Amino acid sequence: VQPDRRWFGNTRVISQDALQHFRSALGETQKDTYQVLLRRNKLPMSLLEEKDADESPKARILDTESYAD
Amino acid sequence: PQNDYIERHIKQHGKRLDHEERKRKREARESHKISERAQKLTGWKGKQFAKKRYAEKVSMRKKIKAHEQSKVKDALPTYLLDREQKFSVPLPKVRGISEEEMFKVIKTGKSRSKSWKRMITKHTFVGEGFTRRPVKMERIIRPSALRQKKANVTHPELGVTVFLPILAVKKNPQSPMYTQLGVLTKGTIIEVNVSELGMVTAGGKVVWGKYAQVTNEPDRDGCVNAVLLV
Amino acid sequence: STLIPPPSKKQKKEAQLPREVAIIPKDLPNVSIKFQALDTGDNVGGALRVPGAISEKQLEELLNQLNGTSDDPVPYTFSCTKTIDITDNLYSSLIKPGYNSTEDQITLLYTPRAVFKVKPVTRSSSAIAGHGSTILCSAFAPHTSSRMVTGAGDNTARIWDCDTQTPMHTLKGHYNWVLCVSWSPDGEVIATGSMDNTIRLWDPKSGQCLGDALRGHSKWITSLSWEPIHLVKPGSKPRLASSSKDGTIKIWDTVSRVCQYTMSGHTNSVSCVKWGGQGLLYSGSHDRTVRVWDINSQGRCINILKSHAHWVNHLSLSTDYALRIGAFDHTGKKPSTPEEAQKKALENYEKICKKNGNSEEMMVTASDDYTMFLWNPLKSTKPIARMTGHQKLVNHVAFSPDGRYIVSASFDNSIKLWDGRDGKFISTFRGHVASVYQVAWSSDCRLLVSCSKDTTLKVWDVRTRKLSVDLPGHKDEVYTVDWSVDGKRVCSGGKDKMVRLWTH
Amino acid sequence: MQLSWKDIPTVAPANDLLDIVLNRTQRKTPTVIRPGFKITRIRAFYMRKVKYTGEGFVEKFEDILKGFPNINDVHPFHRDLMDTLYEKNHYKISLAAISRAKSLVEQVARDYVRLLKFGQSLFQCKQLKRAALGRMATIVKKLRDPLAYL
RNA sequence: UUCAUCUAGACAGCCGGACGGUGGCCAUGGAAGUCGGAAUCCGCUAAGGAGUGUGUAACAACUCACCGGCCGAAUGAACUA
RNA sequence: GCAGUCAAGCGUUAUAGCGACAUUGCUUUUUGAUUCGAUGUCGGCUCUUCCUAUCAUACCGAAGCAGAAUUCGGUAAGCGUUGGAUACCCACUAAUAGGGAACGGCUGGGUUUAGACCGUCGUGAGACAGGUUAGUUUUACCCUACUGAU
Ligand SMILES: [Mg+2]
């Protein structure tokens, strides 16, 4: 592998406006049964799949009190 | 009996009349017994005995050092203390892999007379939306058990490893043919999704794709290890 | 860079189709409304018919007339009940979508707002050097936006002149990291609590150390608090409360430079201490408890609040902005006498405490169990409310300067906005891609600034509940952020050893 | 009701359990394979190793899980007594850690048998078997505190 | 081979001392060196830890760290082959 | 496995470079919830012996081992280690242990040549990603070994 500065650059970036657009759009999509997925767009889905939840997970009790204690 | 009945029994009745003396003589015989075991145990048990003896001696030396050290005697904010955690690539040159090693000849026909199908013996990344070609025209075989989607990426900054999805295969150093087949061997450059690392460019853009180099042999250890190229 | 999809041919054709103009009809009939207050729910005027094309300012003038303050108006905002704010006129706000018919009455809820307006910060005014290690803490002067104090890990504090964006004083008394800085609520003395378990006081005009350090803590200082000006009697200076990892809260008289009380109830590291406006101190520790102490009763623990399942990381009082500001304002006028200063500070504190019948001081506690608890400790010892929804620990919590909203910054890269009275969830601010360390309000409670681990600041608009402007420029993680009292400047600092001043 | 729970087999700690299971594999499965044999024979040798070790760990974990009482299904008097004695939160968390380890060991065995189907030589097949057993050992070592508590 | 101890007493043993503020502070139903969390000081010494383990429900008792009496000439530790 | 941390040693007058034991991250998160390409040789029956890396039987050691029962370990191969159903189940059982002498005599699937059909490819003769059905190889009286007999 030759030395090259292309290896150390970013390959994909996304702007805040695009993030807001896709975050709002994911949720306003209405699936039709007669539309099939021909090709999926490439997106940072971990960034985009953020949902408000009514409840929080339970706390970790082993941090304050171990088994030996 | 209920609760701590053996302790209550010892309190109310004592022990066997030879308990202390017998225990004392056993502890005195321990030095001879340890020497006899070290010289008499054979094979796997002997090797394990020597290994455990070395570990115990190391532990004792560390305890002595800590005792004598005790007897002699990042600039984080308030909410982060009391909490715990050249453009050269790291592998400029890797072992050459020939086509004989890379591919396995698959024989076809009732008497096995045809030999045109080839199977890739290494791990591959086939990309999104992969559908197998029809069996009559399928020359290159990339079996589903050897297809990978995610890799363990180590960031040189902050020294953390994360399980990241694979976006593409950029450069397999063996051949551009292996690059276009998606072969993941040691030294292969891959594109990884770095969304959970929270990287931002100088212009405020969020980085979600970067390059990494594969540092192991997934055909030998069953997983993909890569170091991020920063 | 990944881009949004382009419009299709049909969408371009519909774009080329001529646009419709949102016009107000001239024969639009009058509509019945009932005024009602948001905090008190008092119906004023009954059901009165107003023109359907009524504007916000004309409606506000009518309301000031009906309440009897036409000579001295106070600008309000109007909401409808789904709570929808009245932007431009009643027809466009409510009638134009057609959610309510004209014949039906509309219950319009009016909320008082701030007279002054704070512009959003949009650009880095300057990147100021001088610190040799990571910047840990920062605060603005309570009377002016021209003086800023920043403590860093090179064992020093720094007083910066924000006017020229140049350093003014270097404070080099301490022996370890300067963990916390605080400005006196009358704006006279700077208190710095360090990693070497010491508290040092400084004159800022000369940049000098007042005597020797305050000693008595066996572990590093975690937080500082000042006695409120309105509680401080005239002719005397406020006292300084300090907390440390050893689990004690020490009270210091700076006039005589001594320690008066050492409250010692906690069993683990005290996270924070806040001095309230009714003569109490609220202490939060890693022993999962919040202790209410009474200063008038020789420093005794009055209450123990136990509802958190993990460390309490932060707490915020409703009157915290008023208590920190003292007698000063968004105009920063210096009172003629300590008497008038005390009276003005008392009035400023009362305008937020005493309302809707009786005076209340709500407290909110943000913990490591991913939750917050809203308390009113004067009236009840059980929690008023529990706020859940965050996926990781709530690192920072802040009450709005008027005490109507609560903002919680978490390690799940999110901020959440809650009601400041009953604690019901309103909205989630998203856009940081790394853990959000802390947050700060503007003086007029419309804009919020947050700093993150992702080396960015972000300014949010509260009324629209959406991101206003993203500010990059820091090279490394940002630890501290603050907004000036007059709302003219925002300061930030972190691992890049550079103090960043941001303006409109 | 069961009313009494003396019939729970001994819980070995993590290192002892590792010794028991790995030595059981080395004793009870054949250990001699040659690079000169058929590749089918070599692959079957190492597949048998991986599968047998996985089954040993799974049987130990199952004996732990079946023996211990179900705290929420017992009579409420016993539930309260065992909560006072053993801290129900820690009790259920330790037993759930055992259950998670069981699932992870089954997954590792299945994955590496599937991989071993495509091994081309003794060296590669041996490396895959060593990787599978090492991953199982890592999973078991992460159970050190819950096993001592239990 | 290199370090150390030594007839103003080597190693091994037996005997004696091993104290006073003091049951030091917090904590516990109880907790006195010896379930724990932080300090770990001062005095008198020949020496004696806010204690190395056994032990008690807590104390007690024993122990050993250290010091002395008897004994009387070499001894110990880590390395290399 | 990759990336790191420690540091007994190795090294040296240039705190370079190696580096055992320990250790962290990913894999893999908390309330015991809830089948994915072996491309080329496999199996019966009868019968013998060997290994021990021991499942049972004998004797021991350890464990909150009361008893009963079990677990882990030592010596140990004298002695056993099944009946079925289609590698998994059901059962019986003291127990239903692993392996070698092949895989460096009858017999069923398989190399299964000539007949035939279906599928895929091929302009075609034909070939195969394939699927199904039918298909003669027949010593012993030689030497030796072994069992018995002069
Ligand atoms: Mg044996």
Ligand SMILES: [Mg+2]
């Ligand atoms: Mg034929």
